[PDB]
């Protein structure tokens, strides 16, 4: 028999459309989700061009329109020139992202002035992002207090890092954060296998005591998101590997063996995936839709999963228990044992729903 | 302008049908809910008789279908008799409620034993309540741990609760709480005014410090809850009076004045009487469910409130900012500007929808 979910969350993904289509598209990608029994996603900036003004926003927006087959929401990104220039679309976007370690020229911010800036201007109402390591979470949260406002960090992968945020939370602070499932379920002692291109990843893979410092502060991680990103295995294995990995499609099966394990509870499991990601970035319900999945069937993760371009992953071999057999996404079947039956375009902008906007106090 | 907010929900109400109908009716406390902008209730099993079996159960269940103008999920009550045989009939009740201080005979527990006799034999992934007081609460949490569950406390009353509640958060152990408006907006201060009859609640009114610690603890006050607990102005100001406020319809108002005073932020409000609910209850969502309010009008509060049958109010001259226009429950408008437009009976049991379901794993 068969478990009912509700329509499960990513709020990190990558779907690298526009500009880099050959790594994944909107249809690929949200092919890639569904697979993975995900009916929303959020998706990040960093495409060529990045989502950083409303001209880009407004391309997005249509790209997915048009691309993808699950619903979404689009965020925007930080630049070292847009603090307040995005006042009239922020509400349009899934949240403000700000890349505060490596990123493309496009996303540096050069100082913590121009962090504050972007604190100070983006609606107070709205959710902020932050891909922000080591020190840099504490570095954030202080610019989060100085404007008094909250902050949400982005793919958790350290012990440093999540008992940071466990000390600011025992302070009532209002700091979120989600965790990846390469940094609960990988770990330095997979980097042999992986080699060095194909586990190039930021956050880099954690120690063994970094991965049980996660597991152990469950109580602490508000939400798991993939950060899917994918990059071809051409890229992964050439002369300057990107950094990323492919997620969507074997997320929920990693988390449920976990589950059959007895490592966190199903209700953990959906706290993270559905009501956390919701309540966070004000996400809207999506009416009849539903993940019925399998949590007997044995499964060995193959070199590559059947819908992202990536078409590598680096769990290949990791024995799993759990497999996603139906998506139904708003009264349509979306998925079945491994067909994708709802064609791109199905998607939309949850932010254009009536129960989809950011509640917010009048003029 | 109006303010749309989603569709709110109060996880503690004393509605009184079956067997205290003077007090309050499903239909007269439903209209009194729709009025304050709640929209889903869950109701306490302290009825005549109480809801302490599948019998009472399901004439509750009948009477709520017939009377309810907004959704609802109805309790199950512990009692020194009950443990071992709710299993057939739990996964349709809203969750458990223990009363481990006083309360009528019925739902009387004598021994900590027994309390974890309910804790061993209700199914571990359907909520627990308890009614717990003072060291109660450390005692509750304690049996919560020795059977490796959560807890969800209710009304949290006192500094000497939420900061014993924040020192079990900070250990990880799973443990949510909700606050009533009186003990927020409420104190000693106001017993003078009140008398020894109207003032009569439990948890009883707390210091002023004990308010102020509340307020300074925001942060770890997982919901807002009224425990509406009508009982009529002759029964309050008689030889007995019998505990509790009614609070439906002053509730959202009260919290109004404090978001426009910026005592919290509108989201926190909202993650507080509808995110964290759904969250903790698994409550279903209201398709095309919404509230809009009006955050600019000043009233006084009156002697009674329209709908409820206590036709008593302990708020009575407080000064609120706030107040709701309309309510639109799926799709039929339910309350405007004073008049509830929905019939006894419209509201629906959200345990029954395929959505209301709590997720669990299979046998
Ligand atoms: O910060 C990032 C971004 C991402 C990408 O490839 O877009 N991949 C990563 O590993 N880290
Ligand atoms: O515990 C309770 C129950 C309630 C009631 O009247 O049912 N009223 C109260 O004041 N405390
Ligand atoms: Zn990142
Ligand atoms: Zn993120
Ligand atoms: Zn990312
Ligand atoms: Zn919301
Ligand atoms: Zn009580
Ligand atoms: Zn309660
Ligand atoms: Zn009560
Ligand atoms: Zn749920």
Redesign the pocket.
């Known amino acids: 028999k068969l478990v009912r979910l509700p329509g499960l969350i990513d709020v ?3 779907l690298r459309e526009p500009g880099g289509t050959h790594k994944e598209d909107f249809a690929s990608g949200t092919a890639a989700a569904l697979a993975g029994g995900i009916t929303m996603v959020c998706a ?1 900036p ?1 495409t060529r061009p990045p989502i950083i003004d409303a001209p880009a926003l407004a391309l997005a927006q249509k790209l997915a329109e048009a691309g993808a087959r699950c619903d979404f929401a689009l965020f925007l990104g930080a630049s070292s020139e847009n603090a307040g220039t995005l006042g009239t679309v922020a509400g349009s976007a899934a949240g403000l992202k700000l890349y505060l370690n490596e990123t493309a020229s496009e996303l540096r911010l050069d100082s913590v002035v121009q962090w504050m800036e972007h604190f100070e201007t983006w609606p107070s109402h709205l959710p902020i992002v932050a ?1 922000a390591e080591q020190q840099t979470v504490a570095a954030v949260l202080m610019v989060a207090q100085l404007t008094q406002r909250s902050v949400h960090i ?2 958790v992968a350290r012990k440093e890092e999540i008992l940071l945020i466990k000390a600011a939370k025992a302070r009532g602070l209002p700091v979120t954060c989600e965790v990846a499932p390469h940094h609960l379920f990988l770990s330095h002692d997979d980097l042999e296998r992986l080699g060095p291109g194909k586990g190039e990843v930021r956050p880099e893979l954690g120690s063994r005591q970094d991965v049980e410092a996660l597991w152990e502060n469950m109580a602490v991680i508000d939400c798991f998101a993939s ?3 994918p990059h071809t295995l051409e890229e992964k294995c050439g002369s300057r590997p990107p950094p ?1 990995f492919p997620g969507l499609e074997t997320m929920l099966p990693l988390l449920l063996t976990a589950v059959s394990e007895g490592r966190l509870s199903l209700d953990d499991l959906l706290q993270r995936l559905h009501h956390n990601p919701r309540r966070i970035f004000h996400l809207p319900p999506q009416e009849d839709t539903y993940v019925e999945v399998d949590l007997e069937h044995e499964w060995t993760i193959p070199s590559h999963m059947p819908f992202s371009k990536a078409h590598w992953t680096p769990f290949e071999g990791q024995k799993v228990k759990g497999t996603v057999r139906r998506v139904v996404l708003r009264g349509e079947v979306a998925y079945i044992d491994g067909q994708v039956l709802v064609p791109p375009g199905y998607g939309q902008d949850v932010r254009k729903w009536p129960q989809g906007a950011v509640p917010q106090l009048p003029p």
């Open positions: 990190h993904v990558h990040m960093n891909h982005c793919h950060d899917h990103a990323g």
